[PDB]
Amino acid sequence: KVKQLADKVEELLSKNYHLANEVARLAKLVGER
Amino acid sequence: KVKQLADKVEELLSKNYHLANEVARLAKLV
Amino acid sequence: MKVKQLADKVEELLSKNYHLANEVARLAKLVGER
Amino acid sequence: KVKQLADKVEELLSKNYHLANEVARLAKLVG
Numbered sequence A: 001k002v003k004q005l006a007d008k009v010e011e012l013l014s015k016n017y018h019l020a021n022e023v024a025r026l027a028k029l030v031g032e033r
Numbered sequence B: 001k002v003k004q005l006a007d008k009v010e011e012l013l014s015k016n017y018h019l020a021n022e023v024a025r026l027a028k029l030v
Numbered sequence C: 001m002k003v004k005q006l007a008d009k010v011e012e013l014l015s016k017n018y019h020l021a022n023e024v025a026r027l028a029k030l031v032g033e034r
Numbered sequence D: 001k002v003k004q005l006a007d008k009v010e011e012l013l014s015k016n017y018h019l020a021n022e023v024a025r026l027a028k029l030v031g
Helices: A003-030 B001-030 C002-032 D003-028
Strands: none
Touching: A003 B001, A003 C002, A003 D003, B001 C002, B001 D003, C002 D003
């Protein structure tokens, strides 16, 4: 069903956006001087 | 459109898997 | 002197690591963009 | 004091190597 799949796409776009921000946050912690 | 959305989900799940792996990898570098 | 050479190398590597980490962050945001 | 600074250089080199590898890994995910 389109609605269910559309909701799953939205959820994953959001989750991936936030996980990518976490990669960035951790990278800056590793690089801290 | 169901077909296209299903393919999009498979692609996004792969991106999610890779991003979670990179979070893990960087945490270990801290 | 050896101490000075190494202290300079430490500063150089701190800089390179800081910039590489910023590049990791930049690329992560590209991957994550919606 | 040389021993100490050399040890710090080694740790920073290790970090540098892994950070460069992370740049490579992420660049592959842009596609």
